[PDB]
Amino acid sequence: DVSGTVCLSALPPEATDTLNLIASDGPFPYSQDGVVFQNRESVLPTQSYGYYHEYTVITPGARTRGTRRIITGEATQEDFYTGDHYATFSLIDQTC
Structure with a gap:
């Protein structure tokens, strides 16, 4: 399950950086950025394979x-x- 919704401004600043890179299609800092996330544990809603992709949020x-x-x-x-x-x-929530 998803825990709720959080405003972008309440997340670490690096999450805004990652979202900006997703909007420009990179370039990304890590080779693993953009691979498919399988959702093997079914924490997110069930979808087809390739629906989800993963990107790093850097930890300082x-x-x-x-x-x-x-x-x-x-x-x-x-x-x-x-x-x-x-x-x-x-x-x-990118609106707040």
Whole structure:
């Protein structure tokens, strides 16, 4: 399930950076940005394979990709944030 909706301005600033890169189709900093997210655990709504894609939200100071991600869905404005490596998600509201 999705935990609720959160305004973009209430998320870390790096989530705004990642969304700007998604809108321009990159370039992205990590080679894993843009791969399909399988939703194997069925936390997000069930969809066809390839409906969801994953992008890194950089964690300042981290040596690795860390635990923050944006998952896009194919629908308009359908973007989810996770800060715990896919355990929980919130829908991003870009209007606030």
